[PDB]
Scaffold this motif. Sequence first.
Motif, mmCIF file in Angstrom:
data_model
loop_
_atom_site.group_PDB
_atom_site.id
_atom_site.type_symbol
_atom_site.label_atom_id
_atom_site.label_comp_id
_atom_site.label_asym_id
_atom_site.label_seq_id
_atom_site.Cartn_x
_atom_site.Cartn_y
_atom_site.Cartn_z
ATOM 1 N N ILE A 1 0.890 -1.195 0.000
ATOM 2 C CA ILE A 1 0.000 0.000 0.000
ATOM 3 C C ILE A 1 0.911 1.224 0.000
ATOM 4 N N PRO A 2 0.775 2.156 -0.971
ATOM 5 C CA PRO A 2 1.631 3.340 -1.029
ATOM 6 C C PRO A 2 1.388 4.294 0.149
ATOM 7 N N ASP A 3 2.456 4.896 0.679
ATOM 8 C CA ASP A 3 2.365 5.908 1.764
ATOM 9 C C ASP A 3 1.560 7.110 1.258
ATOM 10 N N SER A 4 1.565 7.355 -0.056
ATOM 11 C CA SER A 4 0.877 8.503 -0.703
ATOM 12 C C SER A 4 -0.627 8.467 -0.419
ATOM 13 N N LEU A 5 -1.203 7.284 -0.187
ATOM 14 C CA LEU A 5 -2.665 7.143 0.051
ATOM 15 C C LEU A 5 -3.068 7.931 1.302
ATOM 16 N N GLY A 6 -2.128 8.171 2.223
ATOM 17 C CA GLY A 6 -2.345 8.999 3.427
ATOM 18 C C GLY A 6 -2.716 10.434 3.087
ATOM 19 N N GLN A 7 -2.349 10.911 1.894
ATOM 20 C CA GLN A 7 -2.630 12.298 1.431
ATOM 21 C C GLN A 7 -4.123 12.482 1.133
ATOM 22 N N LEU A 8 -4.904 11.402 1.047
ATOM 23 C CA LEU A 8 -6.336 11.477 0.647
ATOM 24 C C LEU A 8 -7.184 11.913 1.846
ATOM 25 N N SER A 9 -7.156 13.206 2.176
ATOM 26 C CA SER A 9 -7.838 13.791 3.361
ATOM 27 C C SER A 9 -9.362 13.648 3.253
ATOM 28 N N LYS A 10 -9.922 13.619 2.041
ATOM 29 C CA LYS A 10 -11.397 13.580 1.836
ATOM 30 C C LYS A 10 -11.890 12.136 1.681
ATOM 31 N N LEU A 11 -11.001 11.141 1.706
ATOM 32 C CA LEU A 11 -11.407 9.727 1.481
ATOM 33 C C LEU A 11 -12.366 9.296 2.595
ATOM 34 N N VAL A 12 -13.495 8.682 2.234
ATOM 35 C CA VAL A 12 -14.493 8.144 3.202
ATOM 36 C C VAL A 12 -14.355 6.620 3.242
ATOM 37 N N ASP A 13 -14.090 5.991 2.095
ATOM 38 C CA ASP A 13 -13.982 4.513 2.001
ATOM 39 C C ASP A 13 -12.664 4.128 1.325
ATOM 40 N N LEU A 14 -11.836 3.340 2.009
ATOM 41 C CA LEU A 14 -10.628 2.730 1.404
ATOM 42 C C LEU A 14 -10.849 1.221 1.363
ATOM 43 N N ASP A 15 -11.021 0.644 0.174
ATOM 44 C CA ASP A 15 -11.290 -0.810 0.046
ATOM 45 C C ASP A 15 -10.251 -1.433 -0.886
ATOM 46 N N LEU A 16 -9.300 -2.177 -0.316
ATOM 47 C CA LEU A 16 -8.231 -2.885 -1.066
ATOM 48 C C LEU A 16 -8.311 -4.379 -0.750
ATOM 49 N N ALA A 17 -9.495 -4.864 -0.372
ATOM 50 C CA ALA A 17 -9.697 -6.249 0.111
ATOM 51 C C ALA A 17 -9.582 -7.257 -1.036
ATOM 52 N N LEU A 18 -9.372 -8.533 -0.698
ATOM 53 C CA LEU A 18 -9.342 -9.672 -1.653
ATOM 54 C C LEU A 18 -8.274 -9.424 -2.728
ATOM 55 N N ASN A 19 -7.055 -9.068 -2.314
ATOM 56 C CA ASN A 19 -5.896 -8.880 -3.231
ATOM 57 C C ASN A 19 -4.691 -9.627 -2.643
ATOM 58 N N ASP A 20 -3.500 -9.450 -3.219
ATOM 59 C CA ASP A 20 -2.252 -10.092 -2.723
ATOM 60 C C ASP A 20 -1.303 -9.010 -2.200
ATOM 61 N N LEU A 21 -1.846 -7.963 -1.572
ATOM 62 C CA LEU A 21 -1.029 -6.851 -1.024
ATOM 63 C C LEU A 21 -0.126 -7.399 0.084
#
Length: 589
Positions: A204-224
């Motif tokens: 998961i990129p550290d850059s995703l932390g910049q998404l101040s307006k994000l309500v839903d983060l869904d990265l489920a059912l992957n090989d992260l």
Amino acid sequence: QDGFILQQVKLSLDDPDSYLSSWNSNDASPCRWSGVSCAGDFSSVTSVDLSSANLAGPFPSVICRLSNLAHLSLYNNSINSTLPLNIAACKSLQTLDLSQNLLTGELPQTLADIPTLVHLDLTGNNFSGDIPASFGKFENLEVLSLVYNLLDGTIPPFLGNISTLKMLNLSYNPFSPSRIPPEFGNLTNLEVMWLTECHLVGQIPDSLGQLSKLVDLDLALNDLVGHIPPSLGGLTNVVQIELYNNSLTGEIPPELGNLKSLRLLDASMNQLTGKIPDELCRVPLESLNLYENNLEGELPASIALSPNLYEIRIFGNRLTGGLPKDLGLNSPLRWLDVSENEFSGDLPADLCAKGELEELLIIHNSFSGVIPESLADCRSLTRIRLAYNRFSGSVPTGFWGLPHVNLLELVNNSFSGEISKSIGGASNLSLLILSNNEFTGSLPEEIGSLDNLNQLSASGNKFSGSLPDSLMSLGELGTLDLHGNQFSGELTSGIKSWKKLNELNLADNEFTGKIPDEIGSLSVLNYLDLSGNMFSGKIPVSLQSLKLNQLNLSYNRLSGDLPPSLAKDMYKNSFIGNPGLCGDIKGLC
Ligand SMILES: *[C@@H]1O[C@H](CO[C@@H]2O[C@@H](C)[C@@H](O)[C@@H](O)[C@@H]2O)[C@@H](O[C@@H]2O[C@H](CO)[C@@H](O)[C@H](O)[C@H]2NC(C)=O)[C@H](O[C@@H]2O[C@@H](C)[C@@H](O)[C@@H](O)[C@@H]2O)[C@H]1NC(C)=O
Ligand SMILES: *[C@@H]1O[C@H](CO)[C@@H](O[C@@H]2O[C@H](CO)[C@@H](O[C@@H]3O[C@H](CO)[C@@H](O)[C@H](O)[C@@H]3O)[C@H](O)[C@H]2NC(C)=O)[C@H](O)[C@H]1NC(C)=O
Ligand SMILES: *[C@@H]1O[C@H](CO)[C@@H](O[C@@H]2O[C@H](CO)[C@@H](O)[C@H](O)[C@H]2NC(C)=O)[C@H](O[C@@H]2O[C@@H](C)[C@@H](O)[C@@H](O)[C@@H]2O)[C@H]1NC(C)=O
Ligand SMILES: *[C@@H]1O[C@H](CO)[C@@H](O[C@@H]2O[C@H](CO)[C@@H](O)[C@H](O)[C@H]2NC(C)=O)[C@H](O)[C@H]1NC(C)=O
Ligand SMILES: *[C@@H]1O[C@H](CO)[C@@H](O[C@@H]2O[C@H](CO)[C@@H](O)[C@H](O)[C@H]2NC(C)=O)[C@H](O)[C@H]1NC(C)=O
Ligand SMILES: *[C@@H]1O[C@H](CO)[C@@H](O[C@@H]2O[C@H](CO)[C@@H](O)[C@H](O)[C@H]2NC(C)=O)[C@H](O)[C@H]1NC(C)=O
Ligand SMILES: *[C@@H]1O[C@H](CO)[C@@H](O[C@@H]2O[C@H](CO)[C@@H](O)[C@H](O)[C@H]2NC(C)=O)[C@H](O)[C@H]1NC(C)=O
Ligand SMILES: *[C@@H]1O[C@H](CO)[C@@H](O)[C@H](O)[C@H]1NC(C)=O
Ligand SMILES: *[C@@H]1O[C@H](CO)[C@@H](O)[C@H](O)[C@H]1NC(C)=O
Ligand SMILES: *[C@@H]1O[C@H](CO)[C@@H](O)[C@H](O)[C@H]1NC(C)=O
């Protein structure tokens, strides 16, 4: 001209249910036509909604000749073939919904050539190939939904270049294995990132932390892989985080406690290690799912403080200590699963204080003491699993009779006392499993009142006395296991009423009298064990008719000849310990 153009649309589509009957050429205006909406002093078509009309055939590209068309929905139809590049002719379109259709082939790159487009929904189609590079250049797009398609390209970084994007929905696509582009962190206006089952790989990129307006983060059912970034503490507006079914390692960041709006966290089915942070538990969460991880340490008592908590599923971990004393006191707790952990001590006194607890699943723990008396009044309960614990004392009278309970599993505890007559009140009970306890007394007649009961397993107890006559009333019973008890008396012709019975185990009891001939009437019986009893007289001839995977009539007082089918060397072990049966089979005695 709008009417003439819509007539061309009608001629281009199959309309088996006559949804376009109202589309009459003789009309001065098409505004009253089914699915058509007009605006302005000009009576110009501005919206066409032909959703769920059972329309079939190719996309009607002639519809784009409507100059003022701003909204088009063909949602839930049988629209088929490719989406034409001519779609760019729909230059006024703000919303396009072609979801739940049979559209095939590559996404037309010309979709990005509609400057007014804000909503694009192509969910539930058969679109395949790469997402076009043109999609990076969308002028005003706020929603991109390509969910449940056949897209087999890599997830493109250029999607991060859509500054206006509020929802990125690419879930359920057979994408070529792809990392989450760090450029996605530059989607400042993004509120939803839905990438479930997208074949995501890497960290998961550290850059995703910049998404101040994000309500839903869904990265489920992957090989992260890698750790949940501490930078995710920068998700100020996040309410839902779904990271379940990945290969994530490391500890849950304490920075998740900084997420004031967070209500739903599911990082279950990962390889997470370390302790659940107190800071995260201080947040007033609605659901905390961390099951099937490698977590250890105590569950912070702060989780009990949440007034919104309805779900905690942390099973399959190595968590230690006791459950919070106040758990359920301040929250509408509905689902609790702490099974397969190292939890100890008494159950919290007020789990069902708000009267909403449906599932109490705590199996494979070291919980001790008596069942809380409050749970006797918890009529909301549907599933109870207290098995494989160190519980003691009698089961409370009310607990036996709970109305909506479908499963009561108390197996492998030190429970004592008797099954109360209140069990009659358990109308919904299908599975009753009380095996490996210290239960005493006779089965109550009220057990027979349980018409829906499919399984009665009470093996390894101190139950005594004759079986209740009412037990015959259990027509839906498929499993009866009462082995390792002190049950006495005789079986009756009433056993015939057990038509659906697959297993009968009365082994290691004090039963007497003849095995009823009605045993043969049990067509679907495949398991019969009457061993270690004082059953006497001839073995029923009807037993030949039954097809049994397992048969044991050993260590009884049975006498006389065997039916020819049962008189075999293979069945010798089934009839040992009976003096009367000696000489039925060569080498039996
Ligand atoms: C696209 O859909 C056309 C409309 O057909 C109906 O809706 C479909 C979703 C399906 O439920 C079908 O049973 C319906 O009849 C298809 O057209 C037609 O094809 C059917 C046979 O499947 C035939 O009986 C119809 O007379 C015919 N009507 C028209 C107006 O063409 C398209 O089918 C294709 O083209 C046909 C001529 C035929 O060669 C068929 O094998 C093709 O699949 C559908 N196209 C595609 C690419 O699926
Ligand atoms: C893009 O993906 C997001 C996330 O899946 C979609 O958003 C969400 O939409 C669903 C369905 O409308 C919402 O679900 C429900 O809640 C409402 C009550 O608010 C309830 O009435 C419904 O019955 C349903 O249970 C969900 O809350 C909502 N989630 C978020 C975070 O916004 C969105 O619709 C997708 N867009 C497209 C075009 O695919
Ligand atoms: C998000 O957008 C930022 C602004 O365009 C990017 O930052 C910048 O990086 C450019 C080269 O990628 C550079 O020409 C710009 O001058 C610079 N601008 C500013 C204001 O910093 C940012 O890129 C990342 O951050 C920079 C510092 C480097 O570390 C790059 O390698 C990074 O990719 C964009 N973020 C992402 C994740 O692409
Ligand atoms: C998609 O559209 C179809 C066709 O309009 C809907 O199907 C029907 O369902 C209703 C409600 O159950 C029935 O009364 C109809 O008889 C059904 N018609 C046909 C032709 O199947 C379907 O419900 C829609 N799906 C969604 C999710 O809205
Ligand atoms: C990133 O987005 C910008 C803005 O949508 C794109 O910019 C423009 O490029 C197109 C075609 O090349 C021009 O017609 C526009 O006039 C440009 N607009 C602006 C405001 O610069 C850009 O091409 C996108 N880049 C990628 C890699 O997708
Ligand atoms: C569930 O309880 C049963 C009965 O107490 C356990 O089974 C036996 O194992 C013990 C040793 O721990 C033996 O002394 C007994 O002879 C066994 N009895 C039977 C009937 O097989 C069983 O191990 C327990 N299971 C779990 C997971 O704790
Ligand atoms: C029927 O039940 C009897 C009694 O439990 C079983 O008898 C024994 O067989 C086992 C396995 O070979 C031995 O370990 C025991 O020592 C035997 N016990 C006695 C008291 O003799 C018998 O095996 C069972 N037969 C079937 C077919 O299930
Ligand atoms: C769409 O793809 C699915 C899965 O491959 C397939 O079963 C279905 O028949 C396809 N439909 C069309 C119209 O191609
Ligand atoms: C988790 O993902 C695996 C594939 O890695 C899949 O087989 C399994 O069914 C998934 N389980 C759940 C509950 O999502
Ligand atoms: C019986 O329990 C099941 C869950 O096991 C539940 O879905 C159902 O609604 C219950 N029915 C009644 C009548 O309580």
